[PDB]
Design an enzyme around this catalytic site. Structure first.
Site, PDB file in Angstrom:
ATOM      1  N   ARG C  40      12.538 -16.663   0.819  1.00 12.47           N
ATOM      2  CA  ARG C  40      11.784 -18.152   0.513  1.00 12.47           C
ATOM      3  C   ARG C  40      12.308 -19.245   1.390  1.00 12.47           C
ATOM      4  O   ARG C  40      11.548 -20.174   1.544  1.00 12.47           O
ATOM      5  CB  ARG C  40      12.159 -18.136  -1.032  1.00 12.47           C
ATOM      6  N   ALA C  97      16.847 -16.692 -12.340  1.00 12.63           N
ATOM      7  CA  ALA C  97      16.860 -17.403 -13.538  1.00 12.63           C
ATOM      8  C   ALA C  97      17.607 -18.804 -13.677  1.00 12.63           C
ATOM      9  O   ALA C  97      18.433 -18.772 -12.833  1.00 12.63           O
ATOM     10  CB  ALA C  97      17.332 -16.491 -14.909  1.00 12.63           C
ATOM     11  N   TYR C 157      24.200 -12.210 -19.649  1.00 11.55           N
ATOM     12  CA  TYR C 157      23.117 -11.830 -18.805  1.00 11.55           C
ATOM     13  C   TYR C 157      21.676 -12.214 -19.575  1.00 11.55           C
ATOM     14  O   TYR C 157      20.888 -12.609 -18.640  1.00 11.55           O
ATOM     15  CB  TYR C 157      23.097 -10.121 -18.541  1.00 11.55           C
ATOM     16  N   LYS C 164      14.627  -8.159 -16.768  1.00 15.35           N
ATOM     17  CA  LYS C 164      14.888  -6.871 -16.128  1.00 15.35           C
ATOM     18  C   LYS C 164      14.358  -5.494 -17.008  1.00 15.35           C
ATOM     19  O   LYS C 164      13.841  -4.783 -16.431  1.00 15.35           O
ATOM     20  CB  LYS C 164      16.377  -6.240 -15.879  1.00 15.35           C
TER      21      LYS C 164
HETATM   22  N1  LIG Z   1      24.731  -8.564  -7.091  1.00 12.70           N
HETATM   23  C1  LIG Z   1      24.608  -8.045  -8.370  1.00 12.70           C
HETATM   24  O1  LIG Z   1      25.490  -8.022  -9.313  1.00 12.70           O
HETATM   25  C2  LIG Z   1      23.243  -7.339  -8.721  1.00 12.70           C
HETATM   26  C3  LIG Z   1      23.458  -6.495  -9.698  1.00 12.70           C
HETATM   27  C4  LIG Z   1      22.397  -5.762 -10.082  1.00 12.70           C
HETATM   28  C5  LIG Z   1      20.994  -6.195  -9.734  1.00 12.70           C
HETATM   29  N2  LIG Z   1      20.905  -7.059  -8.564  1.00 12.70           N
HETATM   30  C6  LIG Z   1      19.746  -7.687  -8.295  1.00 12.70           C
HETATM   31  O2  LIG Z   1      19.712  -7.683  -6.794  1.00 12.70           O
HETATM   32  C7  LIG Z   1      18.369  -8.284  -6.427  1.00 12.70           C
HETATM   33  C8  LIG Z   1      19.104  -9.163  -5.291  1.00 12.70           C
HETATM   34  O3  LIG Z   1      20.061  -9.864  -5.693  1.00 12.70           O
HETATM   35  P1  LIG Z   1      21.604 -10.121  -5.065  1.00 12.70           P
HETATM   36  O4  LIG Z   1      22.435 -10.098  -5.941  1.00 12.70           O
HETATM   37  O5  LIG Z   1      21.025  -9.426  -3.666  1.00 12.70           O
HETATM   38  O6  LIG Z   1      21.368 -11.900  -4.552  1.00 12.70           O
HETATM   39  P2  LIG Z   1      21.101 -12.547  -3.355  1.00 12.70           P
HETATM   40  O7  LIG Z   1      21.867 -12.245  -1.985  1.00 12.70           O
HETATM   41  O8  LIG Z   1      21.237 -13.909  -3.868  1.00 12.70           O
HETATM   42  O9  LIG Z   1      19.429 -12.358  -3.050  1.00 12.70           O
HETATM   43  C9  LIG Z   1      18.637 -12.714  -4.237  1.00 12.70           C
HETATM   44  C10 LIG Z   1      17.096 -13.138  -3.454  1.00 12.70           C
HETATM   45  O10 LIG Z   1      16.396 -13.605  -4.546  1.00 12.70           O
HETATM   46  C11 LIG Z   1      15.261 -14.373  -3.514  1.00 12.70           C
HETATM   47  N3  LIG Z   1      14.439 -15.404  -4.419  1.00 12.70           N
HETATM   48  C12 LIG Z   1      14.581 -15.784  -5.749  1.00 12.70           C
HETATM   49  N4  LIG Z   1      13.531 -16.425  -6.046  1.00 12.70           N
HETATM   50  C13 LIG Z   1      12.736 -15.966  -5.039  1.00 12.70           C
HETATM   51  C14 LIG Z   1      11.270 -16.338  -4.892  1.00 12.70           C
HETATM   52  N5  LIG Z   1      10.550 -17.159  -5.699  1.00 12.70           N
HETATM   53  N6  LIG Z   1      10.444 -16.057  -3.760  1.00 12.70           N
HETATM   54  C15 LIG Z   1      11.456 -15.341  -2.830  1.00 12.70           C
HETATM   55  N7  LIG Z   1      12.581 -14.879  -3.035  1.00 12.70           N
HETATM   56  C16 LIG Z   1      13.219 -15.419  -4.175  1.00 12.70           C
HETATM   57  C17 LIG Z   1      16.271 -15.132  -2.919  1.00 12.70           C
HETATM   58  O11 LIG Z   1      15.654 -15.849  -1.593  1.00 12.70           O
HETATM   59  P3  LIG Z   1      16.149 -17.371  -1.084  1.00 12.70           P
HETATM   60  O12 LIG Z   1      17.662 -17.393  -1.260  1.00 12.70           O
HETATM   61  O13 LIG Z   1      15.396 -17.576   0.032  1.00 12.70           O
HETATM   62  O14 LIG Z   1      15.532 -18.106  -2.157  1.00 12.70           O
HETATM   63  C18 LIG Z   1      17.470 -14.252  -2.430  1.00 12.70           C
HETATM   64  O15 LIG Z   1      17.238 -13.668  -1.278  1.00 12.70           O
HETATM   65  C19 LIG Z   1      18.030  -8.953  -7.702  1.00 12.70           C
HETATM   66  O16 LIG Z   1      16.870  -8.453  -8.316  1.00 12.70           O
HETATM   67  C20 LIG Z   1      19.051  -8.908  -8.602  1.00 12.70           C
HETATM   68  O17 LIG Z   1      18.396  -9.105 -10.019  1.00 12.70           O
HETATM   69  C21 LIG Z   1      21.974  -7.826  -8.248  1.00 12.70           C
HETATM   70  C1  LIG Z   2      27.597 -10.561 -17.138  1.00 19.96           C
HETATM   71  C2  LIG Z   2      26.709  -9.584 -16.251  1.00 19.96           C
HETATM   72  C3  LIG Z   2      27.551  -9.334 -15.016  1.00 19.96           C
HETATM   73  C4  LIG Z   2      27.111  -8.591 -13.710  1.00 19.96           C
HETATM   74  C5  LIG Z   2      25.729  -9.188 -13.355  1.00 19.96           C
HETATM   75  C6  LIG Z   2      25.476  -8.719 -12.031  1.00 19.96           C
HETATM   76  C7  LIG Z   2      24.346  -9.251 -11.376  1.00 19.96           C
HETATM   77  C8  LIG Z   2      24.427 -10.181 -10.590  1.00 19.96           C
HETATM   78  C9  LIG Z   2      23.438 -10.786  -9.762  1.00 19.96           C
HETATM   79  C10 LIG Z   2      22.076 -10.535 -10.216  1.00 19.96           C
HETATM   80  O1  LIG Z   2      20.912 -11.322  -9.774  1.00 19.96           O
HETATM   81  C11 LIG Z   2      20.854 -12.745 -10.016  1.00 19.96           C
HETATM   82  C12 LIG Z   2      19.807 -13.253  -9.554  1.00 19.96           C
HETATM   83  C13 LIG Z   2      19.540 -14.467  -9.684  1.00 19.96           C
HETATM   84  C14 LIG Z   2      20.133 -15.199 -10.848  1.00 19.96           C
HETATM   85  O2  LIG Z   2      19.791 -16.579 -11.211  1.00 19.96           O
HETATM   86  C15 LIG Z   2      20.542 -17.385 -10.559  1.00 19.96           C
HETATM   87  C16 LIG Z   2      21.474 -17.297  -9.500  1.00 19.96           C
HETATM   88  C17 LIG Z   2      22.170 -18.205  -8.830  1.00 19.96           C
HETATM   89  C18 LIG Z   2      21.945 -19.688  -9.432  1.00 19.96           C
HETATM   90  C19 LIG Z   2      20.959 -19.881 -10.251  1.00 19.96           C
HETATM   91  O3  LIG Z   2      20.491 -21.058 -10.569  1.00 19.96           O
HETATM   92  N1  LIG Z   2      20.187 -18.482 -10.798  1.00 19.96           N
HETATM   93  C20 LIG Z   2      20.993 -14.453 -11.717  1.00 19.96           C
HETATM   94  C21 LIG Z   2      21.412 -13.057 -11.150  1.00 19.96           C
HETATM   95  C22 LIG Z   2      21.727  -9.683 -11.488  1.00 19.96           C
HETATM   96  O4  LIG Z   2      20.763  -9.463 -11.852  1.00 19.96           O
HETATM   97  C23 LIG Z   2      23.293  -8.961 -11.956  1.00 19.96           C
END
Ligand SMILES: NC(=O)c1ccc[n+]([C@@H]2O[C@H](COP(=O)([O-])OP(=O)(O)OC[C@H]3O[C@@H](n4cnc5c(N)ncnc54)[C@H](OP(=O)(O)O)[C@@H]3O)[C@@H](O)[C@H]2O)c1
Ligand SMILES: CCCCCCc1ccc(Oc2ccc(Oc3cccc(O)n3)cc2)c(O)c1
Ligand SMILES: NC(=O)c1ccc[n+]([C@@H]2O[C@H](COP(=O)([O-])OP(=O)(O)OC[C@H]3O[C@@H](n4cnc5c(N)ncnc54)[C@H](OP(=O)(O)O)[C@@H]3O)[C@@H](O)[C@H]2O)c1
Ligand SMILES: NC(=O)c1ccc[n+]([C@@H]2O[C@H](COP(=O)([O-])OP(=O)(O)OC[C@H]3O[C@@H](n4cnc5c(N)ncnc54)[C@H](OP(=O)(O)O)[C@@H]3O)[C@@H](O)[C@H]2O)c1
Ligand SMILES: NC(=O)c1ccc[n+]([C@@H]2O[C@H](COP(=O)([O-])OP(=O)(O)OC[C@H]3O[C@@H](n4cnc5c(N)ncnc54)[C@H](OP(=O)(O)O)[C@@H]3O)[C@@H](O)[C@H]2O)c1
Ligand SMILES: CCCCCCc1ccc(Oc2ccc(Oc3cccc(O)n3)cc2)c(O)c1
Ligand SMILES: CCCCCCc1ccc(Oc2ccc(Oc3cccc(O)n3)cc2)c(O)c1
Ligand SMILES: CCCCCCc1ccc(Oc2ccc(Oc3cccc(O)n3)cc2)c(O)c1
Lengths: 255, 256, 256, 254
Positions: C40, C97, C157, C164
């Site tokens: 994005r 979110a 969350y 989700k």
């Molecule tokens: N880390 C965790 O604890 C965790 C755990 C379970 C699931 N997840 C899931 O893993 C996936 C990736 O999250 P992450 O933790 O890897 O964080 P991340 O590295 O922040 O990646 C999240 C991505 O969401 C993209 N994004 C948000 N709005 C968008 C939009 N409107 N169009 C295109 N891209 C958009 C961002 O792109 P830009 O930066 O370019 O905006 C970013 O690359 C998510 O679905 C999240 O819910 C994460």
């Molecule tokens: C209490 C829950 C602990 C573990 C949560 C792990 C987790 C970590 C990251 C996750 O991915 C997102 C992606 C975007 C997001 O919304 C955000 C992130 C950064 C700034 C912002 O304004 N909104 C919240 C979580 C996700 O779905 C789940």
């Protein structure tokens, strides 16, 4: 829920703290006629004393050890001769060896595993087969389970696998007896301080984590189980079968 | 996903070329694993000696283990350990119930039938895990085979359904217990497959055909498909996955 | 454990080297896939151009797609198709979110916050699937990233948990719909991983540490572990698997 | 006995509405009832249907749950008119008919978010506003369908909305638990209603229930009502975050 002119068999009261005595107090208070089954002589003694608190004008007590087909077959047959057809059965029976309710589930013995299956799961199937004979126009069977049948809970070990078996038992019985208008359901009770709770390691740790983490931030009691049992055993729950109702302050819904 | 060379797996419950476990074997063998087979009936050993001709295994490692006997499980694994050393995992493909109980009314199931099905179909995993652990000092993977009838009441599956419910809880309690040892435990929930044991289940053909009409992929799965997911579950690809139930069933679990 | 040479995958949602999607990319790249990236923010493209130096990809295929815009999704995929041809699958790693809504009280969530989270975190899969299908005439695989908070209420969350839940239903309805086209749709339920988006969730550090103490494997997972399961889900290893949610979370889903 | 209790029932359109089953059961048990409606036609139906209940006063309030103002002002006015309440039955959903047939993958953004807005988000804001009238606790029940837990052909976008609703009930349960407000769902089997006409293949499903569900019969609105009375009363103390299936056991089979 007026349950006047209804008759229920409650299996597994040992003392005043038994979940099944919660059930009994609620059903009794709603006007049901109640019939009790017990294994140990001491449980009959407790029942004769506890009946003084209920409004039941007649003690209907039957010794049934669910490890014996004969006792289940003969018990229900005699219940039928003494009070006639019944409207449902509350099953509150389980057992596993204390050896197997702590330490390592992988070290469970064959004999311990099958004992827990026999008493805690199979007993429902044979009780249902024999109780069906007294429910020609239908009724309701409820078993008592715990969240450790759906998720691996530390220390619940072999009883967890038995409750998984019990819960599948309720579903296969529901499917089989549905056409006979016999509903079968489970209550998944949160932890309650009972005599059998003393057999489970880490029981006090769990009580307190419920208070801190469950949605209602408190533990449930036996009467709360009883109120949901009254729902499940009455016409209020027509349409519900093969269900597992969690009476646990919402703990099942969180992670 | 490069390679199970230098790995060793025990596969339990091949009877013939249509066995789910032979699908597993063909996939693991093709990926370079060393394989060790266990059987109950003498006929299953005969089938194994003939089926090994199709695999690339240069040595038949065959061990008779009836999982109703503690001694045979204990002594079988102990002997496997002396013959090939430490292993990397176990594929458990073993179940049984009496035909009398797989069509009846479930409510008429006998105590003996119910406990037989628990003993062979569920408890066997616990004791196999306990004995296999001794050959996985640095960790490994254990996979059991289940069916959707352990999660829902499926007509005719009856007593085997309650046994699979027990098996699935078994996998979770084992996962929790052996996790700290770096031993993962998981299940594959296979769709219906034409096997010798399938003949014991009433209405089996009716279910095959409803899968074709209703499951998302509008087709049934085969033994090799189970095998490919088993290779995932038995390899480092699935590091991080334990206590899981993977459905290899054309998506039928996801619909209603 | 063979090979994704001659395969092409679109990976959506790399922001930096800690992104879950970069774990996926490193595994798929290492297995010989051709990779195509969508982003994005301009900064995410900059990170991608720098991260491509670590991969073996001989050509950067980068496409700006904000999944809130139909046009960008429709035109992005159409252009991917013109540049590299048909693809074999899509890894969707996108959610959002507002931080206002990821703490305190779920009951105070705004309509705008709720629908924003649905739009980006759930609906995006549906329209990505519709547009990606056009590049998978002979079938393929789509994988989305979820978290256990879509199946249970996890404190903090909040709105993302309902999103989700929506995403996981999305995978099932897509699986059913696209199954006959031989397009499988699945989810990976990743345990908590230290990413840039993790900073938006209150109590994230508390959860990391409870995983270490309570999950079966007594450790947390990483991005590469998610990547290895993604390779399973995106390859022929998982033929027969669709509508499934694989938990890559040290077994934490299986306990209570 | 629900005498001295007061419940708000949201989503009666006519005598076949699930919420009118709920109303007849709660009314029969002595509850005071308050009704909310969207369209003027639903008010007309309500004024006529109230003649069948024993309610001695019609308490009718127009609330379109797409408008925060109407939800906020509706409940605020309910509070001024009847005082504190004991719970809310939510029986509201919508999706475009275009999106409830053919291919889920062709769903529009606007269709998807409309279904989320009306069928899921409405519960969150109703809960926030109803909480203000439940200072000493109460019970909120929403209506769902098995298509929120499994992909059912033709239910499509409404299925994803019910999945969202069901997670909504759990997050609300967790959040409002400490306030002694329980939140639960009833998963009703198929029932011939006005909204059922919008779902393709609805008749096919009715009949498969009769052949396959454990009780070999379909459920009705009053059966939903009886389980709602359980969930809205002290009988279900200890139950929250739960989804009770009132569906002849169909959820328990494959
Ligand atoms: N880390 C965790 O604890 C965790 C755990 C379970 C699931 N997840 C899931 O893993 C996936 C990736 O999250 P992450 O933790 O890897 O964080 P991340 O590295 O922040 O990646 C999240 C991505 O969401 C993209 N994004 C948000 N709005 C968008 C939009 N409107 N169009 C295109 N891209 C958009 C961002 O792109 P830009 O930066 O370019 O905006 C970013 O690359 C998510 O679905 C999240 O819910 C994460
Ligand atoms: C209490 C829950 C602990 C573990 C949560 C792990 C987790 C970590 C990251 C996750 O991915 C997102 C992606 C975007 C997001 O919304 C955000 C992130 C950064 C700034 C912002 O304004 N909104 C919240 C979580 C996700 O779905 C789940
Ligand atoms: N308390 C809890 O935390 C809790 C939570 C969830 C589920 N449950 C379940 O609730 C049920 C009742 O347990 P409880 O906690 O109320 O403990 P309890 O009062 O000790 O009652 C357990 C009953 O099991 C009976 N029993 C054991 N083996 C039997 C046999 N072979 N034949 C007949 N009866 C037999 C005992 O009768 P005798 O004393 O006469 O031997 C006893 O009355 C059990 O199924 C238990 O698993 C309890
Ligand atoms: N095919 C299906 O529709 C289906 C679907 C889902 C899951 N499954 C599961 O797949 C697994 C294998 O079944 P299958 O369909 O492959 O049938 P299969 O080819 O008949 O194999 C079943 C195996 O169970 C073994 N067995 C039974 N009792 C044993 C015992 N006491 N000790 C040692 N081995 C024992 C048999 O060995 P002997 O021949 O030597 O007795 C046989 O090798 C089972 O767990 C089954 O429940 C099958
Ligand atoms: N019937 C079934 O097979 C079944 C099964 C499972 C679940 N359900 C659920 O049961 C609930 C009630 O449906 P039903 O079958 O009883 O149909 P129904 O009688 O037509 O009721 C649906 C109600 O939703 C209201 N509504 C829609 N959008 C609204 C909005 N934006 N603001 C306020 N009200 C709105 C309608 O009001 P208007 O008439 O003024 O449009 C109508 O009163 C729904 O949640 C539905 O998803 C039904
Ligand atoms: C680590 C979990 C703590 C919460 C467990 C809640 C619970 C408490 C009691 C339960 O019921 C029994 C019944 C018999 C049983 O086995 C026993 C009990 C006493 C003595 C003995 O030898 N075995 C164990 C638990 C039950 O199924 C579940
Ligand atoms: C309801 C029909 C669709 C499900 C059947 C798929 C299936 C097929 C075979 C399965 O494995 C067994 C293994 C042994 C078994 O018991 C048998 C087999 C042959 C003879 C006999 O006496 N018992 C029953 C099923 C199994 O677990 C599941
Ligand atoms: C293929 C499964 C059929 C059984 C579905 C049971 C069911 C029946 C009715 C349900 O409620 C609604 C409510 C609104 C709705 O959207 C509508 C309704 C009327 C007109 C319109 O344009 N949209 C669709 C279904 C519901 O959520 C579920």
């Amino acid at each position: 829920v007026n349950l006047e002119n209804k008759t229920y068999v409650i299996m597994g009261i040992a003392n005043k703290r038994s979940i099944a005595f919660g059930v009994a107090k609620v059903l009794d208070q709603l006007g049901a006629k109640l019939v009790f089954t017990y294994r140990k002589e001491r449980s009959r003694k407790e029942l004769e004393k506890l009946l003084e608190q209920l409004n039941q004008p007649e003690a209907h007590l039957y010794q049934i050890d669910v490890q014996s087909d004969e006792e289940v077959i003969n018990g229900f047959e005699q219940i039928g001769k003494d009070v006639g057809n019944i409207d449902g059965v509350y099953h509150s029976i389980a057992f596993a060896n204390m050896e197997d309710l702590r330490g390592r589930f992988s070290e469970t013995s064959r004999e311990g595993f099958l004992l827990a299956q026999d008493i805690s799961s199979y007993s429902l199937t044979i009780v249902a087969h024999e109780a069906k004979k007294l429910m020609p126009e239908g009724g309701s069977i409820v078993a008592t389970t715990y969240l450790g049948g759906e998720f691996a809970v530390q220390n619940y070990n072999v009883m967890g696998v038995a409750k998984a078996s019990l819960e599948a038992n309720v579903k296969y019985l529901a499917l089989d007896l549905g056409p006979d208008n016999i509903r079968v359901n489970a209550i998944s009770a949160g932890p309650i301080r009972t005599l059998s709770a003393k057999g489970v390691g880490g029981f006090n740790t769990i009580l307190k984590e419920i208070e801190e983490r469950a949605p209602l931030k408190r533990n449930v009691d036996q009467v709360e189980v009883g109120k949901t049992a009254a729902y499940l055993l009455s016409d209020l729950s027509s349409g519900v079968t093969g269900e597992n109702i969690h009476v646990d302050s919402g703990f099942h819904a969180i992670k």
